Design an enzyme around this catalytic site. Structure first.
Site, PDB file in Angstrom:
ATOM      1  N   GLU A 116       0.842  -1.208   0.000  1.00 55.50           N
ATOM      2  CA  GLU A 116       0.000   0.000   0.000  1.00 55.50           C
ATOM      3  C   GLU A 116       0.870   1.248   0.000  1.00 55.50           C
ATOM      4  OE1 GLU A 116      -2.779  -0.854  -0.869  1.00 55.50           O
ATOM      5  OE2 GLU A 116      -2.755  -2.896  -0.127  1.00 55.50           O
ATOM      6  N   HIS A 143       1.838   2.200  -3.635  1.00 53.63           N
ATOM      7  CA  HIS A 143       0.826   3.053  -4.259  1.00 53.63           C
ATOM      8  C   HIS A 143       0.894   4.497  -3.742  1.00 53.63           C
ATOM      9  CE1 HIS A 143      -1.396  -0.162  -6.080  1.00 53.63           C
ATOM     10  NE2 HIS A 143      -1.813  -0.684  -4.941  1.00 53.63           N
ATOM     11  N   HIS A 185     -13.245  -7.062  -5.646  1.00 55.65           N
ATOM     12  CA  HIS A 185     -12.339  -6.560  -6.672  1.00 55.65           C
ATOM     13  C   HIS A 185     -13.049  -6.373  -8.033  1.00 55.65           C
ATOM     14  CE1 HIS A 185      -8.804  -7.659  -4.157  1.00 55.65           C
ATOM     15  NE2 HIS A 185      -8.118  -6.912  -4.996  1.00 55.65           N
ATOM     16  N   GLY A 232     -15.292  -2.870  -7.353  1.00 59.70           N
ATOM     17  CA  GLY A 232     -13.913  -2.338  -7.376  1.00 59.70           C
ATOM     18  C   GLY A 232     -13.524  -2.085  -8.805  1.00 59.70           C
ATOM     19  N   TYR A 249     -11.485  -3.701 -10.838  1.00 62.72           N
ATOM     20  CA  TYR A 249     -10.808  -4.860 -11.472  1.00 62.72           C
ATOM     21  C   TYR A 249     -11.714  -5.755 -12.317  1.00 62.72           C
ATOM     22  CZ  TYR A 249      -7.047  -3.456  -8.288  1.00 62.72           C
ATOM     23  OH  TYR A 249      -6.057  -2.736  -7.612  1.00 62.72           O
TER      24      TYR A 249
HETATM   25 ZN   LIG Z   1      -2.306  -2.797  -4.984  1.00 62.05          ZN
END
Ligand SMILES: [Zn+2]
Ligand SMILES: [Cl-]
Ligand code: NA
EC number: 3.4.24.70
Length: 695
Positions: free
Chosen positions: A482, A485, A613, A617, A619
């Site tokens: 994290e 990112h 996800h 999300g 994805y």
């Molecule tokens: Zn990630």
């Protein structure tokens, strides 16, 4: 009552969001007032629009930014501080927000101005970042249905409205399902094998459901489905019936009754296919790929390449587990099931490498992990990170806030960190989110740029009583991930707000810097800087570091296959699957599983109902993004291996290049090009395979 609409915290100008003063009651008034103001700004923009930065791109950013920041902060609070009143408020305003996003996205005066920029005779002289921005706006407008006639347009907007509603519903059912299961243990026998740490957690849990005499030692225990509870049960519970019960409960979260996500999934896929056809594609995966480096064919190729490389190892992993259990005289060795895998994997891991997770925990306290992570960031990227608690309002007393400075002592960025599991109100998993972007347009008068601000959120084992959070190695890697990112958001050198940070980075490249950071957990200097006993200060013994290192590739084949199963099922559901027919999503799951796992899923497997996800999300037809970017991250790390990981001069020089390419350029240059600028050549999947012992 009592306060003016004009005093609503969501409507004020602020440097850091008012996370401590905003609650459910502010949402309807604040968001509805905001949207009225933004409608008026958009009308003014359309009226004066010209194909120039001051008449098009700057006023557009001011509108998009305000919506993104304010809505972003409400959605953040829904994810870390959920309440029924906040859910109802968001649901009541969400259609108006989406309506406005559609109005904005479908603006013909804005779109035609962007096309005029693209069609300009000196386009080639416009900066690369600004080219990327213009091309992205044109492509995005088409993807939000601007080219459709008014009747098809109407149908498109209704689909968009329903998808936003279903996705929020999907995530609420997952939170609610994870919250609901509570197993009270009274008979000490049933809990045999659970380590002290877990005991201490289930007793601390025990207290806040009544049972106030409860201790780790003796007093009763509540078992929950959030990861820090569920995992130790599966790794350690000697009681096979308890493993099977906790497994089956985990596997069926949000799959029946009022929390069922099945019909929601069915409706999401139906609408996703309708959307794809309105836009002239064959399926939703083609729509997803429009904004990605990959194509359906190229993604499938990579997955099949990695699958082929992982399969024999995964088969051997299964045989190794059977052999080991059998040599322990375990009756289930003749019929190993999914609720035995984690347990026997951990027994094998302990015996084979001689490491015990529970005994490592004192060396991985959050304060020391954060100190070592920041020391690494200083070495690689030249930044100094320090606590700045009090500077920004926060939503919970466990939330940390930090200031990021350059070498001359100047602030360049900030971030929040909300580290602990809190399943009563806080979404599972771990993530990074933007708070505000780095932006010239949004700067205060007299300053050149607004500094970027990020969120890091984890759900790690909470502190037990008075001591710090003591972590597993997996939880350490999650923090590093994290943080990766956050660094891309925070260290960006783009001042063009709409392509700064992680914005406009093709989704199959956004997992590059996060996965890249995780490699450093195995770097000796980094691990040793972190691993100090929390009471004692003693560094982890060298020989223990060596066992950790040896265990890195343990079951790499099985872990790889598991990720490939997730990526393949995602792709299959958004390509070949046609909803409404005889075949269910669970049938797809079984079929794809034949080649991506060594034994079939249970017929009762409903993991799809928690697969946020892809259903709640970014994805959807994109889960393969992790592996696609892991090829890039592994190969990026190999640049440091090549340069020499034992040579501090080479590490800093390579780190600076990484900082000035992957972390600096945002979406202002195509990701393959940024990667080549760092690496010296196009990517290879050989490093990823080598790192995981799968050559
Ligand atoms: Zn990630
Ligand atoms: Cl329109
Ligand atoms: Na593509």
């Amino acid at each position: 009552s009592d306060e003016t609409l004009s005093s609503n915290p969501l409507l004020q100008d602020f440097d850091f969001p008012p996370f401590d003063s905003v609650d459910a009651s502010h949402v309807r008034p604040g968001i509805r007032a905001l949207l009225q103001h933004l409608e008026a700004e958009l009308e003014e923009l359309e009226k004066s629009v010209e194909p120039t930065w001051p008449k098009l791109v700057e006023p557009l950013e001011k509108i998009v930014d305000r919506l993104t920041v304010v809505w972003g902060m409400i959605n953040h609070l829904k994810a870390v501080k959920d309440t029924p009143e906040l859910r109802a408020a968001i649901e009541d305003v969400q259609p108006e927000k989406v309506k406005f996003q559609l109005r904005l996205g479908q603006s013909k005066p804005i779109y035609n101005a962007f096309k005029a920029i693209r069609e300009s005779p000196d386009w080639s002289s416009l900066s690369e970042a600004r080219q990327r921005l213009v091309e992205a706006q044109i492509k995005e407008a088409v993807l939000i249905g601007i080219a459709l006639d008014d009747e098809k347009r109407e149908e498109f907007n209704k689909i968009e409205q329903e998808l936003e509603k279903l996705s929020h519903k999907f995530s609420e059912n997952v939170l609610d399902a994870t919250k609901k299961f509570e197993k009270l243990i009274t008979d000490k026998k049933e809990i045999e094998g659970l380590p002290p740490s877990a005991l201490g957690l289930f007793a601390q849990a025990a207290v806040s459901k009544g049972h106030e005499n409860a201790t780790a030692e003796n007093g009763p225990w509540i078992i929950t489905l959030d990861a820090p509870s569920y995992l130790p049960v599966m790794q350690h519970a000697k009681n096979r019936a308890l493993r099977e019960e906790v497994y089956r409960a985990y596997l069926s979260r949000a799959s029946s009754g009022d929390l069922d996500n099945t019909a929601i999934i069915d409706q999401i896929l139906k609408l996703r296919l309708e959307k794809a056809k309105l836009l002239g594609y064959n399926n939703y995966a083609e729509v997803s790929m429009a904004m990605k480096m990959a194509t359906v064919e190229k993604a499938a190729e990579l997955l099949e390449k990695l699958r082929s490389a992982s399969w024999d190892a995964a088969v051997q992993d299964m045989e190794d587990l059977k052999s080991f259990a059998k040599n322990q005289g375990a009756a289930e060795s003749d019929s190993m099931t999914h609720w035995d895998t984690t347990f026997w994997s951990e027994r094998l891991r302990e015996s084979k490498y001689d490491i015990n997770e529970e005994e490592l925990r004192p060396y991985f306290s959050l304060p020391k992990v954060m100190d070592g992570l920041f020391s690494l960031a200083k070495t690689l990227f030249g930044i100094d990170i320090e606590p700045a608690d009090g500077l920004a309002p926060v939503w919970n007393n466990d939330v940390r806030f930090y200031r990021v400075k350059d070498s001359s002592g100047n602030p360049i960025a900030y971030f929040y960190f909300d580290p602990y599991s809190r399943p009563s109100e806080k979404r599972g998993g771990a993530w990074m989110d933007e708070v505000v972007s780095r932006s010239r347009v949004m700067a205060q008068k007299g300053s050149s740029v607004r500094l970027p601000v990020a969120h890091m959120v984890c759900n790690q084992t909470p502190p037990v009583g008075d001591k710090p959070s003591l972590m597993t190695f997996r939880e350490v890697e999650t923090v590093f991930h994290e943080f990766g990112h956050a660094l891309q958001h925070m260290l960006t050198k783009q001042d063009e707000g709409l392509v700064a940070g992680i914005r406009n980075i093709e989704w199959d490249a956004v997992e590059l810097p996060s996965q890249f950071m995780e490699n450093w957990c195995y770097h000796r200097d980094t691990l040793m800087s972190i691993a100090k006993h929390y009471e004692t200060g003693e560094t982890l013994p060298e020989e223990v570091y060596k066992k950790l290192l040896a265990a890195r590739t343990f079951r790499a084949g099985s872990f790889s296959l598991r990720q490939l199963k997730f990526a393949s099922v995602d792709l299959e559901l958004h390509t070949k699957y046609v909803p409404g027919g005889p075949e269910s999503i669970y049938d797809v799951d079984q079929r794809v599983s034949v080649k991506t796992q060594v034994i079939p899923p249970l017929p009762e497997d409903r993991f799809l109902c928690s697969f946020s996800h892809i259903f709640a999300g970014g994805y959807a037809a994109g889960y393969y993004s992790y592996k696609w970017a892991e090829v890039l991250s592994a190969d990026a790390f190999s640049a440091f291996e090549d340069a020499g990981l034992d040579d501090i001069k080479a590490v800093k020089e390579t780190g600076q290049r990484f900082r000035n390419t992957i972390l600096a350029l945002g979406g202002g240059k195509a990701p393959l090009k940024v990667f080549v600028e760092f690496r010296g050549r196009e990517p290879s999947p050989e490093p990823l395979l080598r790192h995981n012992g799968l050559l």
